Symmetry: C3
Subunit: 449 residues, 3 copies
């Protein structure tokens, strides 16, 4: 009873204005460390089941270490960037002399500390697993040399349990060339993660946002394998910083709009190409063309500013009056008269053309409405299912009021044959000029004759 | 010796007509449940190694619990839908008063029952893991023995074994914001999944299909996290319902067709844009443009009807006669004279142009054919490898006869310069008129002079 | 101080010329085998806790077995191929009578041997896990002791450990329809893979390359489940063969270039469309349009030749002089005046237009340059961050000198109104004719009047 939606029959589109923004504007880089134990060399002869298992597990431990040692419409306008450029930058610094030692020094006493590195950047550091103390002090002295007898079997379980976390981490990086996303629990546990969130210099609200949506933060995060110099494993976890919160958001749904004259082809189509998510953020509007990049948790819409264009606030005028002189609304044209449907947040837009059967159904009563060739909309409340031809769409069941804005479909104002129909990222004014050009050429070419 | 294929030299394309359809037309939604035990940490001072291990695992049990609680060419014409709209709808319903209790009541005695929810929808319910009973009857009485003794270790192994499944499920949902696809074995074992299939209201053959192909069914399925209200964990598994089965299918492979005049550029190219999978289903044909979206198991072709267009049966005329007055076949044009190859089901199409070295090879004898600049086809039988420039393509080793359909390459019928070469989703007639318009303009503009 | 980069002001583009090539030109196919044990459930009335666990684990063993039996700009110019065609071809061969026996016999005594199959192809074969011997010699004699005793628990741990590897492979294949990529450690451990590489018929240098980049080898690899005939499981690991090595490589960054006339729209834009990776390999150049397909390890660039075009070495002339008569440089045009940025290897190309705030910042001193509407570039050394509007991009911190090449941006040479602005894949020569044709229409149509 928050989120609402409006359908514009005039432009075959719909806008949902009940959403709140969640923009990633930046990156925070933290350094996670694991103090590791070097081994040389377990030398136990005689194969005892209890001896073989510890050795085998220790062999598993060593191989992990070895593997790590071994590792060392629209949208086309967005441009390119390097997602892990920030994280890689941190990794690079870590490859310096006794920088390891600097950080290895601060984390000896506590498991958490900020160390200023020679780049000058202060970074939160975490020692989450100390296999070293356990392996070097409990395990290693018994194994050397010749006689090794291991009793109390619960010990081999404890070591496999402790070692296990390291093994999944070595496993993941192995299948991701040292960059994983999303960041798994093995890489960084929730307690560790929540602890990480509290020292990040963001708003108490921003911390609040991330903590209720940790599962989202993980998908927008990167874990980057760096170095294993000295006796410490170190990798950098790259977390999103949300500089934009609680600003109004809206999602634009579009569908092909065509004339419904009786002939077979000879039809003209039209489709709005500025579909996607729009959000208010700095007096302008951040527009996200590919709405795959935006995750939704009801009230909150999570987006990454890298795949976006920053547009003027006049962009909203295209939804109410597409012919405004203040903004040239982006569109496409076609002769492709094909039926399809678009499921919106609180309903469904149905582009029905030709002899195609377009229908809406309820789970209980069955078919409840047969569409009359054109762009229409139906609420989510009285409808559960939509079938367009042989393809069946399911409708969203959220709560919220929808508004049908009546208006003559815009495509009907144009005379065929003078209409430009092969336009992919054109616009209103860009269409009008070609018609004008064609209006001039048709009109001037008979005046002379 | 089932599947066959025909190649049309006239249009540089090939259709494989030995396939059978498997269309997902709809969705079936089931609710999977796990009964959980509400437990309050025992203030136990016992420092026993085996209890600590149980304690650690019980923390793991709890951490798992805590995380879940915390969670609470062409193709562009296909339109968008909501894949999990069906699954999401069920989830929403489950958030009501004692709806949980309703299902919790029916599943106390049996692990399987159909329950009618207040929406009215009847849903198959499954209790596949009863950790509550194990924890309350096997674990809890042992952990609280006043003396934190523990007898033998098989208790901790047994608990880690039972608890393990829940942990992988909590893990997957954790890295998927509560929606996973495909549905893993941890989410639903083969035995559970197969049992599920038999109660789905489909044909005995449809059950057979899904049962011989669970791995495909899994990939076309969704698992959706709902609620963990009461002392029960509940998630909804969304399985595909295949309403179209055993209808003839065929796959269309297309490749660039250009003139092979000796000049350097000045060439004209042509390409069929309706590549992809076609299947007979309701007197019409569902067309799947991106054939990435279609999985193949020899005889069976698995597609999702939501990502499809429903076309008239005259589409087959595009394979036999492209100039028919009955259907306007979709094509595109270009001046880009670039060499490439298309590997079909029983072969490879080779588009050879310019000075480019084009060759086909057998593993044993080496080069067996050198192509003369143009569109050709080669059977899978006498050929093992095909080489176009610096890129090497491997050819499919299936069995089936191929037929070479001779015909003058169509591109030779057009006079350059009058040819429209910048067309992305145009068509035969759309070309003819533009040629006509351009034919008129050249012709009227000289009669006048 | 190896890798360098040059920015051309004349064409709003940048070339990184410090790279070395790694082209996958081919495929190598190997056969991995697991000897399995045929077992018939012991009708054992023994209710021992340890036997039950083994029984439970043996069913997982059995269920895995059962699951397997049940299993039984640019880029659009690239064309399509079949990635797994080579591996599938091998799989097909393994489906023959006693082909299995031929290989099961050679691998009975040793774990590694070359076997000639009836197709004639010689293939490296590997037995990495002999559960058969473990189950038949360690497990089976223990489970059937008339009395379902079990002595000690280490028997159940050892079996779960051995079985785990089998369980993950069946798991992976289960969620991948029998084709997995990348090939996990469970499918093939590092020791197995390294052992595998030395017998591949490549250069001692080629072996050196793969061994230092196994994690990359895995990602460009496929593992293909074949048959479980007889009592042996066999699947084929398909590894890349890199026929092109140590040849010079370069990456091309491009960005929109537009006029900066004061007016609102009425602007003309221009963009080089040949972005991606270019490499010297056979006197020609292999071009990779989608640079998603390329993994970077500093000096070495890993690409797949299937997603590439082979172009003449004269393509480089477009970088120095885009108007040379020897090669028609590929470009695109638009009237879309939108600001965006492109992060290069040693910097960032900045397309700044309209009233948009375009800025570059250092972490310490903050903003250090505000762009004056246009295409610019900045080195990585004195700059750490770039901000365009509301979107903030991070820049790479690699080391290397970049060079600013002064020259008038080419777009200023075209007179508006005669300029063609709706072109997606056109070129230099193709534009001039349209300009010419349009210059002609303006020039001839007034001489007459």
């Amino acid at each position: 009873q928050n989120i609402t939606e409006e359908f514009y029959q005039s432009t075959c589109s719909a806008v949902s204005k009940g959403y709140l923004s969640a923009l990633r504007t930046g990156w925070y880089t933290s350094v996670i460390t694991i103090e590791l134990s070097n081994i040389k060399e377990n030398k136990c002869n005689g194969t005892d089941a209890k001896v073989k298992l510890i050795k085998q597990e220790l062999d598993k431990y060593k191989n992990a270490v070895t593997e790590l040692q071994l590792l060392m419409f629209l949208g086309f306008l967005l441009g390119v960037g390097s997602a892990i450029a920030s994280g890689v930058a941190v990794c690079k610094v870590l490859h310096l002399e006794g920088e390891v030692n600097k950080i290895k020094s601060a984390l000896l006493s506590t498991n958490k500390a900020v160390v200023s590195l020679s780049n000058g950047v202060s970074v939160l550091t975490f020692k989450v697993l100390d296999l070293k103390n356990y392996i070097d002090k409990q395990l290693l002295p018994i194994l050397n040399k010749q006689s090794c007898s291991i009793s109390n079997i619960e010990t081999v379980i404890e070591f496999q349990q402790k070692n296990n976390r390291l093994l999944e981490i070595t496993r993941e990086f192995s299948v991701n060339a040292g960059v994983t996303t999303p960041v798994s629990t093995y890489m960084l546990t929730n307690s560790e993660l929540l602890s990480l969130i509290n020292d990040m210099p963001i708003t108490n609200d921003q911390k609040k946002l991330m903590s209720n949506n940790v599962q989202i933060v993980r998908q927008q995060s990167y874990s980057i394998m760096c170095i294993i110099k000295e006796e410490v494993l170190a990798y950098v976890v790259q977390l999103p910083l949300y500089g934009v919160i609680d600003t109004p958001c809206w999602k634009l749904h579009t569908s092909p709009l065509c004339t419904t004259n009786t002939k077979e082809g000879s039809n003209i189509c039209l489709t709005r190409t500025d579909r996607g998510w729009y959000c208010d953020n700095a007096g302008s509007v951040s527009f996200f063309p590919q709405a795959e990049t935006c995750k939704v948790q009801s009230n909150r819409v999570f987006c990454d500013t890298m795949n976006s264009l920053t547009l003027p606030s006049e962009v909203n005028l295209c939804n109410v009056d597409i012919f405004n002189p203040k903004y040239d609304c982006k569109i496409m044209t076609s002769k492709t008269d094909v039926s399809s449907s678009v499921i919106t947040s609180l309903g469904a837009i149905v582009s029905c053309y030709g002899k195609t059967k377009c229908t809406a159904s309820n789970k209980n009563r069955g078919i409840i409405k047969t569409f009359s060739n054109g762009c229409d909309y139906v609420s989510n409340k009285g409808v559960d299912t939509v079938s367009v031809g042989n393809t069946l769409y399911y409708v969203n069941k959220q709560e919220g009021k929808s508004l049908y804005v009546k208006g003559e479909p815009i495509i009907n104002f144009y005379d065929p044959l003078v209409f430009p129909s092969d336009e992919f990222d054109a616009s209103i004014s860009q269409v009008n000029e070609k018609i004008n050009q064609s209006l001039a050429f048709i009109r001037k070419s008979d005046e002379l004759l």
